[PDB]
Amino acid sequence: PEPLRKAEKLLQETGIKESTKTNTLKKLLRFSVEAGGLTEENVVGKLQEILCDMLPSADKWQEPIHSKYIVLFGSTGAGKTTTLAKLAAISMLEKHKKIAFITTDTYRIAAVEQLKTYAELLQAPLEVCYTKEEFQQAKELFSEYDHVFVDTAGRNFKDPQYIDELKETIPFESSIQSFLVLSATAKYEDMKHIVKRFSSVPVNQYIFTKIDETTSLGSVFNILAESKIGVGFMTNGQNVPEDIQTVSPLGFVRMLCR
């Protein structure tokens, strides 16, 4: 095989899983044998289209912030708080909205200070909530606001009591967009499990963090391929509020291929 040896090479460098890698060459080979001739130049194009077709449709990516309540939950240290700040900063400064915070992360030390200092900078109010009732109450106070950004404590969501804890603290009944936050630095086999545990909770979008920190995006692709939802944001550094961005399925696949 000629350029297909090259396509085989690309797929190698992305961290995609073997099954997938293979099945992509199948589709690739199939198409090209039975339909015209592909150059060493034009392979990549076709390759990317094929991969992209395995990801959720674009209308399921880059969902904008509309709902009143914006919740991020996810793994420990993944960057939830930092990302919440960025998101909020955008809502106030760029989009000129009345914003407020709730935090639920009573567990980790200084997590409240952390969000507090952001809320102070942004001159927005902040409620700590230990219970759904307190949360429901907080809702009353913030009824005049446009957006309430809600932070939560990172847990080992492999163990499902924390899924329970979470569900028993957040009212998903509400006008609410919920983002599952995972680190681009995480192992696929790990994320796979997390996403299973989150099955019983209404996640709207993924957020992938620290894409500036990992060598390959294959792991993230692998997750997205087995998912019915797309990615709302990706983060690429520690700086607030600059280091956030959005992507389309194609835009994502381009990143995948270096």
């Binding site: 900063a89 400064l93 952001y118 900078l121 942004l122 520690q238 700086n239 607030v240 509020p241 600059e242």
Partner: peptide
């Protein structure tokens, strides 16, 4: 020097 440096600068400017 602070991961929030930029944001801080933006808020200072708003104030102005």
């Amino acid at each position: 020097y602070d991961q929030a440096a930029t944001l801080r600068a933006k808020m200072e400017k708003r104030e102005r």
